[PDB]
């Protein structure tokens, strides 16, 4: 019921140097989860292996995942395969509109196995993902 | 003569949750190697860097490798380049038939430099790889 | 003014087993930097995450980077995105002529955001990169 895992991939630690930092993002997400009667567990890593371990744990616990894989979105089959194990919903979030930039950003290995996908609505995208999981 | 390195990539630790676990696989491989008069050293990691170090060691020791790179099979040039250094045979194994699934799984950076490749014969594929190395 | 970061990616630790080793390369680069009135800080890792941290530090310090990403050159969007943060020049170096080999080596995620690119001039490529940064 309560626990939602928010997982951020490579370079998302560099947020705010917008002016919103990753710590600020964690704080916004936590607050919104509280207002929605959820607990958000937010994690970020530049390491593919660390991201896979976190997905493994969400699979074993049957908890939902909101995932912004950063660059790995367009490149990693390993991450996609880890996510394919999830039984609870997977929501893909991108801060920027990945369809308005380079062609390589318009393909995601994650989109076809995600429940849904939100892009280009900024940091609010994460909050809106939270809200979707709350009404489901 | 005796030593064969079996290297498993990302997500192969999730075997059995088939019902064959990775530990079970290690056990099957070891037994078969013993019956063939070989020693199997089996290793698994979700970390590309760890996989590359293991390939580096096989190159320096001039020992054979049976490799199931998981997702990295379709994506990693770095791993392919590490494997290109091997002087002893490289056998590529996939549990599933990667040619019966998504198009992206039908390209391997490893196949063109491998001695040969076995797919879709399940866990027995590893054992059959062992047997090939024993008669060569 | 003085500091230039030279960053080597996966498999570059295997140099010399040419006969030039990575340690030898570090030594050549340092000497040339000294003769040019610079300091070269040379680093190598098989770990994408480690490479990204080093790029993050160059971005925060506003220092230049000479980067040979190895295999990650052709595959990593995450590394490209990290490098896009650099305000000082980025020079891409490849020891081999990547345009004379397999087709996959003829695409780089880094070239379009690099100041310039040197390939196929061997280890001297790094020294020539140093010299460019010295006259700019
Ligand atoms: O959510 C995304 O828009 C995306 O997933 C798009 C994806 O295609 C891309 O790989 C990505 O990482 C981009 C990125 C990551 C780090 C940096 S630092 C300066 C620019 C920059 C850009 C990201 C993550 C991202 C987005 C905006 C920002 S601003 C500082 C970092 C960062 C990361
Ligand atoms: O040997 C393969 O068939 C392959 O190399 C194919 C390759 O295209 C793929 O990246 C891969 O990793 C797939 C994978 C890895 C982990 C998991 S967990 C639930 C599904 C799943 C799937 C694998 C490894 C693989 C195969 C079957 C199974 S079952 C649980 C994990 C796993 C991993
Ligand atoms: O600078 C390059 O030419 C390149 O960036 C080209 C790039 O397309 C490739 O991924 C790469 O890594 C290649 C590589 C890396 C390690 C090894 S060990 C035996 C062969 C080999 C080849 C490299 C790095 C490279 C180049 C030459 C040598 S010789 C031993 C390692 C190595 C690495």
């Amino acid at each position: 019921e309560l626990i939602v895992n928010v997982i951020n991939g490579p370079n998302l630690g560099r947020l705010g140097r917008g002016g919103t930092t990753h710590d600020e993002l964690v704080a916004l997400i936590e607050r919104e989860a509280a207002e929605l009667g959820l607990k958000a567990v937010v994690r970020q890593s530049d390491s593919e292996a660390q991201l896979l371990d976190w997905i493994h744990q969400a699979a074993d616990a049957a908890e939902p995942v909101i995932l912004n894989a950063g660059g790995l979105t367009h490149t990693s089959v390993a991450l996609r395969d880890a996510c394919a194990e999830l039984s609870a919903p997977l929501i893909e979030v991108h801060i920027s509109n990945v369809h308005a930039r380079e062609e390589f950003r318009r393909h995601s290995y994650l989109s076809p196995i995600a429940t849904g996908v939100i892009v280009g609505l900024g940091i609010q995208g994460y909050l809106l993902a939270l809200r979707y999981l709350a009404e489901h």
Side-chain angles (χ1 to χ4, degrees), chain A:
Chain A
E1 188 194 351
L2 272 83
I3 299 178
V4 175
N5 297 284
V6 182
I7 303 175
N8 288 322
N11 298 308
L12 279 145
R14 309 291 294 168
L15 275 182
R17 17 213 83 209
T20 308
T21 61
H22 190 267
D23 289 343
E24 178 67 19
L25 177 64
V26 173
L28 284 159
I29 281 162
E30 283 172 347
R31 181 175 74 193
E32 188 78 357
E35 148 175 329
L36 293 169
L38 305 164
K39 195 181 176 186
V41 177
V42 186
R43 296 279 183 271
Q44 189 279 324
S45 183
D46 290 353
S47 170
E48 186 171 55
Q50 179 64 76
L51 298 185
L52 295 174
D53 185 44
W54 291 327
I55 295 288
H56 298 332
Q57 293 175 41
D60 289 334
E63 300 167 340
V65 172
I66 296 176
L67 175 63
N68 182 351
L72 296 188
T73 305
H74 319 292
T75 67
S76 177
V77 173
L79 187 54
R80 170 202 174 108
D81 289 343
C83 293
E85 213 186 334
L86 298 169
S87 62
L90 171 62
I91 318 302
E92 182 185 357
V93 176
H94 299 298
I95 293 172
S96 72
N97 182 351
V98 294
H99 302 104
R101 311 169 65 181
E102 308 93 316
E103 181 62 19
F104 63 79
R105 289 186 210 282
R106 311 190 181 190
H107 315 284
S108 167
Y109 284 106
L110 299 177
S111 295
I113 67 167
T115 302
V117 183
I118 298 170
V119 311
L121 301 181
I123 268 162
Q124 213 189 334
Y126 292 95
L127 308 198
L128 296 169
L130 275 181
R131 196 169 287 274
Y132 168 89
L133 299 165
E135 274 83 336
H136 296 245

